[PDB]
Design a protein around this ligand. Structure first.
Ligand code: NAI
Ligand code: FMN
Ligand code: SF4
Ligand code: SF4
Ligand code: SF4
Ligand code: SF4
Ligand code: FES
Ligand code: FES
Ligand code: MG
Lengths: 230, 43, 59, 433, 217
């Protein structure tokens, strides 16, 4: 066949060429930590949370953007991968605001969950945090940019899925801000999905604000009747 | 043959449009550009 | 340290301290707390309902 | 006798850049008297394989700072055509603090660069060369444009190059103030009209470069010599410096020296000999030396005790734990606040980070704040090891090497001048109770 | 220190979409020549030179100029905003007639650049982020300008003035505000990157063409 053999933690897996390390890892039930990778969006590689160790390689690789080579042995739980994850989460949480009680992403945060599973439990950041002014993109989506981790998922979704090129980044370095640079309404028939794709409370639902927490809700699977798509 | 002089003195009289004027002048020497097949990636 | 009748506190300015995070509701072993919230008229995150059933509470 | 053991004294007949000081006409007529554009038609007619072999046996390594072997890098692009045009991009961003070598080449020997672009593009089969120059070098860019106009007028480049029947164009592109645009992928993205943010590798530019076509990115210094190596032999070039450290190098000596200058010298020259001969020695005598950053701000610094016998090449400086880099020597005597100098370098790196990836974007600002507090002594000795580990987290986890270049000076300062940090901390502690 | 400037746009009578900006016909010829260099099917590669041309024509980059550049090259205005805010050579706010950059990175910091900066400050009476009341000088600090060997140096409107002293920079300033324009280059009798005195290398006349050419070619 065309499949090639790769090893995830010493276990043989057969995968099609061009398959990334993340997909090869998930073919055995291992989910690599991620913040900027979405499987329905183009690869970014900016977050750096997906860094894993390949055996016999001194450098850790971005599992979300690196195709597996023939005979590679991935090491998803070695000391190097764990230290990389802890460092990346330390950097992510360095400037994050202490907003979890007032954040609507409270029990639904990938930042929170992956900090509990892959990060450290302490902080050694002894400086002042950064603060970003809010941007108004319309009634449907509430914006609290301080919480943004600069994943850029929203920009890719707007550019590709929604066909609207209004979202971007201005500035560079620590002071880099996601927005429109002008007072503009991000209007689209699919504009509400940037709330779901955003892993943090930077983009949240405005009608839903403050009304509930995820652990209270009871989930009912149903069908939409507002159009004929179903 | 001398070395007491400085020969790179033409840049003392360059204006703000020197580079673009030179680009315009060189426009008539370049080979035709290759085409992607579309007018833009958004086409 | 004595635990006695419950009370909701304020900030020195007179603003309520509670921000409707619902951590008290999630931790209550007896499920004695019920909370509802919404944005206030000024946009503040404040409760609209905060009940404690003291015949359910284990103090 | 073969197998030389001492290096650092080459006379003018073996210097590639014979107009480094702009003392001869830089115009085509003056450059041709210096041997520029001589037998180009024959070199092109030899073939890409001959030029690639000449570069390979020459032992040349990348002069941008990484020191990658130029032969294999340029032969990576020797693939057959697949429908996409092939391009050459010459890196003239010139962003490293302390470095000034490429500016002199562009402003004083531009025809060397143009001919190097032609020869390298023929070697790689490139259709055209894009020269990405720093946006601040407006006079240098216009001089390069004048040189390109002269080359077009004489039929040296363009349709039917000198006599080879090989079409090749040389464009000049100006950036707008971004040191990150010296990264080859960031430079490529900047040419395509986006933010100067680096791409991930793989793919490499030899597969997906500018406009999504195979591209090779080379330094101006690396590219300019190419013509000379082909002519004078290549095996002549390997006769200079140690093994795997071949050739001639341009050095930028700045800081606390009597006469700062840009000079050309053999690769494996010792640092002390270079400083004493060309720079005129350290201010106040060699005994007044405190620390030196050998290859620009991106490399760790070394104390005076290491500068006594160190060789100015890639491998010897690697053994001294600093690396060669761009061969820009910044000299610091005993009258400088070394912590302040390293903090200023870290602030530079903070103001130049593009912000794309998490480790650089937050960790560099974190180190900047920590070093700002270190300068005043407003910290405690455990923060030294904390900063060391922060730098370690940043290094090797970033997309491009700007995080590496921000972490390395911090590690060098911690490694060599920890007692200075502790003295400052205790002084601030007892001064403020 | 910090950026100081903001990366969001708020409308203003001096800067709004209706603010009049357009390219001169000569500048349209220049834009055509710029666009021609890049491959057909790729025109967004011309945003940098066209935006720089707009800034050169106008003196700064209003929101209308960004929108015009986006319209001409048929790209989303957000991408032009990204380019304009990313690069520090673009002025999204009016500057003085003579915009002064003083390099303060470590190689220039070692050669007493702070003296140059304070001499400029007390000559003009403004700080490092202000413009003179007559709108003729704007003073800022920048990173390494690539003139480190000749440092301490400052760059003015595409010109380099190296090997400076407080007296030299004051002479440059008062010669510039009189209506003249000082000649660029070092002010230490060096006029190049050569060693301060002696010219330790390249003393011999340059060799003739084909002097070291190898055999067989
Ligand atoms: N001259 C200047 O102003 C500055 C120079 N630098 C220097 O840049 C150096 C680091 O730059 P990098 O490009 O990230 O170093 P690198 O080691 O990643 O690669 C350098 C060159 O080798 C090529 N290359 C490397 N591995 C390859 C592979 N497996 N296949 C094909 N090609 C490969 C790359 O395409 C690139 O052109 C630093 O050492 C620094 O000193 C840094 C800042 C400024
Ligand atoms: C942050 C950063 C800045 C850089 N700046 C430059 C530069 O200004 N000039 C340069 O030639 N290379 C620069 N480089 C490295 C380039 O990749 C290098 O020039 C390119 O690989 C050409 O290598 P060569 O000289 O071996 O051909 C930089 C790298 C990084 C990470
Ligand atoms: S986004 Fe997540 S981590 Fe950040 S404040 Fe909200 S709940 Fe906390
Ligand atoms: S707003 Fe959310 S989705 Fe958009 S860049 Fe920030 S964290 Fe990512
Ligand atoms: S909801 Fe409960 S835990 Fe949260 S602020 Fe109010 S009283 Fe405190
Ligand atoms: S290391 Fe810094 S400059 Fe390089 S890609 Fe990451 S954020 Fe950008
Ligand atoms: S998930 Fe791979 S770098 Fe973000
Ligand atoms: S340090 Fe001033 S020009 Fe580079
Ligand atoms: Mg969200």
């Amino acid at each position: 066949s065309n499949l090639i053999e790769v090893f995830v933690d010493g276990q043989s897996v057969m995968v099609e060429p061009g398959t990334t390390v993340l997909q090869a890892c998930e073919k055995v039930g291992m989910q690599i930590p991620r913040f900027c990778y979405h499987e329905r969006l183009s690869v970014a590689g900016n977050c750096r949370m997906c860094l894993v160790e390949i055996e016999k390689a001194p450098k850790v690789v971005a599992a979300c953007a690196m195709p597996v080579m023939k005979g590679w042995n991935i090491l998803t739980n070695s000391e190097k991968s764990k230290k990389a994850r802890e460092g990346v989460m330390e950097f992510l949480l360095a400037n994050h605001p202490l907003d979890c009680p007032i954040c609507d992403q409270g029990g639904e945060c990938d930042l929170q969950d992956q900090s509990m599973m892959f990060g450290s439990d302490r902080s050694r950041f002894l400086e002042g945090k950064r603060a970003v002014e809010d941007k108004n993109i319309g009634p449907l989506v509430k914006t609290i940019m301080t919480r943004c981790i600069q994943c850029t998922r929203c920009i890719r979704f707007a550019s590709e899925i929604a066909g609207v090129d209004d979202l971007g980044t201005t500035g560079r370095g620590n002071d880099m801000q996601v927005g429109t640079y002008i007072e503009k309404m991000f209007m689209s028939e699919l504009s509400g999905n940037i709330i779901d794709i955003c892993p943090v409370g930077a983009l949240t639902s405005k009608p839903y604000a403050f009304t509930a927490r995820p652990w209270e809700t009871r989930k009912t699977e149903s069908i939409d009747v507002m159009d004929a798509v179903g | 043959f001398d070395n007491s002089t400085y020969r790179n003195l033409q840049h003392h009289e360059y204006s703000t449009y020197t580079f673009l004027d030179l680009n315009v002048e060189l426009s008539k020497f370049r080979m035709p550009q290759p085409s992607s097949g579309r007018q833009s990636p958004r086409h | 340290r004595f635990r006695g009748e419950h009370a909701l506190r304020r900030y020195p300015s007179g603003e309520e301290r509670c921000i409707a995070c619902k951590l008290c509701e999630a931790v209550c072993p007896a499920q004695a707390i019920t909370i509802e919230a919404e944005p206030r008229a000024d946009g503040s995150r404040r409760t609209t309902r905060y009940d404690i059933d003291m015949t359910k509470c284990i103090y | 006798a073969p197998k030389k053991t001492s290096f650092g004294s080459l006379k003018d007949e073996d210097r590639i850049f014979t107009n480094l000081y702009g003392r001869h006409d830089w115009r085509l007529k003056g450059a041709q008297s210096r041997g520029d554009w001589y037998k180009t038609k024959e070199i092109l007619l030899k073939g890409p394989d001959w030029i690639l072999g000449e570069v390979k046996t020459s032992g040349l390594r990348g002069r941008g700072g990484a020191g990658f072997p130029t032969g294999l890098k340029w032969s990576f692009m020797n693939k057959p055509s697949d429908g996409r045009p092939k391009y050459l991009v010459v890196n003239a961003d010139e962003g490293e603090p302390g470095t000034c070598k490429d500016r002199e080449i562009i402003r004083h020997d531009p025809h060397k660069l143009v001919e190097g672009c032609l020869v390298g593009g023929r070697a790689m089969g490139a259709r055209a060369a894009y020269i990405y120059i720093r946006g601040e070098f407006y006079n240098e860019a216009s001089n390069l444009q004048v040189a390109i106009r002269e080359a077009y007028e004489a039929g040296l480049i363009g349709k039917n190059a000198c006599g080879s029947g090989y079409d090749f164009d040389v464009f000049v592109v100006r950036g707008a103030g971004a040191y990150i645009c010296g990264e080859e992928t960031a430079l490529i993205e900047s040419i395509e009209g986006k933010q100067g943010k680096p791409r991930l590798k793989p793919p490499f530019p030899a597969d997906v470069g500018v406009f999504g076509c195979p591209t090779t990115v080379a330094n101006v210094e690396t590219v300019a010599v190419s013509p000379t190596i082909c002519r004078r032999g290549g095996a002549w070039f390997a006769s200079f410096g140690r093994e795997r450290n071949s050739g001639t190098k341009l050095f930028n000596i700045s800081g606390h020296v009597n006469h700062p200058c840009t000079v050309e010298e053999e690769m494996s020259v010792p640092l002390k000999e270079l400083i004493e001969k060309h720079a005129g020695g350290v201010i106040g005598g060699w005994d007044n030396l405190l620390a030196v950053i050998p290859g620009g701000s991106s490399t760790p610094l070394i104390p005076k005790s290491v500068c006594e016998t160190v060789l100015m090449d890639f491998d010897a400086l690697v053994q001294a734990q600093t690396g060669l880099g761009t061969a820009a020597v910044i000299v610091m005597d005993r009258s400088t606040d070394i912590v302040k100098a390293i903090a200023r370098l870290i602030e530079f790196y903070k103001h130049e980070s593009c912000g794309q990836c998490t480790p650089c974007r937050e960790g560099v600002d974190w180190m900047n704040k920590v070093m700002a507090r270190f300068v005043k002594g407003d910290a405690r000795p455990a923060e030294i090891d904390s900063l060391w580990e922060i730098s370690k987290q940043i290094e090797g986890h970033t997309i491009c090497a700007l995080g590496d270049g921000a972490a390395w000076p911090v590690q060098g300062l911690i490694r060599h001048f920890r007692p200075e940090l502790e003295e400052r901390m205790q002084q601030f502690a007892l001064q403020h109770q | 220190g910090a950026g100081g400037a903001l990366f969001v746009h708020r409308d203003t009578p001096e800067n709004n979409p209706d603010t009049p900006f357009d390219f001169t016909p000569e500048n349209y010829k220049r834009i055509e020549a710029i666009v021609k260099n890049y491959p057909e099917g790729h025109k967004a590669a011309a945003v940098l030179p066209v935006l720089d041309l707009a800034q050169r024509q106008n003196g700064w980059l209003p929101i209308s100029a960004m929108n015009k550049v986006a319209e001409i090259l048929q790209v989303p205005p957000m991408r032009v905003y990204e380019v304009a805010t990313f690069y520090t050579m673009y002025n999204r706010k009016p500057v003085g007639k003579y915009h002064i950059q003083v390099c303060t990175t470590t190689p220039c910091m070692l050669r007493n650049s702070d003296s140059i900066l304070e001499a400029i400050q007390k000559k003009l009476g403004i700080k490092v982020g202000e413009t003179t009341p007559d709108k003729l000088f704007t003073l800022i600090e920048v990173e390494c300008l690539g003139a480190c060997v000749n440092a301490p140096m400052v760059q003015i409107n595409d010109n380099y003035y190296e090997d400076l002293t407080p007296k030299d920079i004051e002479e440059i300033i008062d010669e510039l505000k009189a209506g003249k324009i000082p000649k660029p280059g070092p002010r230490s009798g060096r006029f190049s990157c050569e060693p301060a005195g002696g010219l330790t290398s390249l003393t011999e006349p340059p060799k003739g063409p084909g002097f070291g050419v190898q055999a067989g070619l």
